[PDB]
Paper text:
Protein Tyrosine Phosphatase 1B ([name]) is the prototypical protein tyrosine phosphatase and plays an essential role in the regulation of several kinase-driven signalling pathways. Here we identify [name] as an inhibitor of IL-6 and show that, in vitro, it can dephosphorylate all four members of the [name] family. Dephosphorylation of substrate is initiated by nucleophilic attack by the active-site cysteine (Cys215) to form a phosphoenzyme intermediate followed by hydrolysis of the cysteinyl-phosphate to release free phosphate. Asp181 acts as both a proton donor, enabling protonation of the tyrosyl leaving group, and as a proton acceptor, receiving a proton from the water molecule that hydrolyzes the phosphoenzyme intermediate.
Residue numbers in the entry:
A (entry chain D): 1005 to 1010
B (entry chain A): 2 to 302
Amino acid sequence: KEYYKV
Amino acid sequence: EMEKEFEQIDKSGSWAAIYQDIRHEASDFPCRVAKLPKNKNRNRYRDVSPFDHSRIKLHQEDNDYINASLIKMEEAQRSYILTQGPLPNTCGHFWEMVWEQKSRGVVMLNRVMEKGSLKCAQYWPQKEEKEMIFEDTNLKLTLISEDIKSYYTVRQLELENLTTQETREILHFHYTTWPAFGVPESPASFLNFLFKVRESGSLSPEHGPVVVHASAGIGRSGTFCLADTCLLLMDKRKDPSSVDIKKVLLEMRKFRMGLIATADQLRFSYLAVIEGAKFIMGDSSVQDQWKELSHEDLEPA
Ligand SMILES: [Cl-]
Ligand SMILES: [Cl-]
Ligand SMILES: [Cl-]
Ligand code: NA
Ligand code: NA
């Protein structure tokens, strides 16, 4: 959610 | 020759392998400033930070931090600034950087909203008559004109330093159909856009570095810059077989983490350079062929 790569 | 390597990688199906090779071999430098507690709300993503040694510094005494990195390609003879999609509170910082660095172009590769999620603030004005004032940084931004094509839009903006009343023309190149973690429609669509950026002079050494961003500023922008640099290298050496794409990407990753976010984006970069080589090697006509295959012109009424 606040990460580019999940 | 580069084609041989590509076909070989395609036939073997090892793009994921080559990509993880790059990921393992990639520079790992510290990002202390980016991680300070006072910069938490200046970073879009916790996992995407500029290295301390290559970050852009805002020329301001309060806090000089912006999530942006200078990619300086010594051999290619070009610099780029890669940055995240500005946040609501960092639109002023963003245009401050553009001013201080004397950039003439901004290349945007995402949309402010993708898949119903905000990916970037509306940091430029959509209507001529509604200019934007960034008070914290004393800058005014006005839409002068725009040229809307089917998959990208070029916008002519005027940036005014309210302190000195000096004004600058900024060109905005907005690629509107490039999905996050995805690739362009075709090499022709990507290259048509890239050579539009080049033809504007926004990449000339007579200006500051072009600013390139997406949402995080590593995936699509990494793809964009990688392709442009390799094509520069091919033109200088004149020998396409000399340019090692993987080596170029690793160089670039010394200045910003994560450039190229998927193996398919890596595969596409190869495709783009191989196709773009046709222009390097002196085919004047191929540029018009890209424009047709891109279907950039919209449908009249
Ligand atoms: Cl702090
Ligand atoms: Cl969408
Ligand atoms: Cl990565
Ligand atoms: Na103005
Ligand atoms: Na000025």
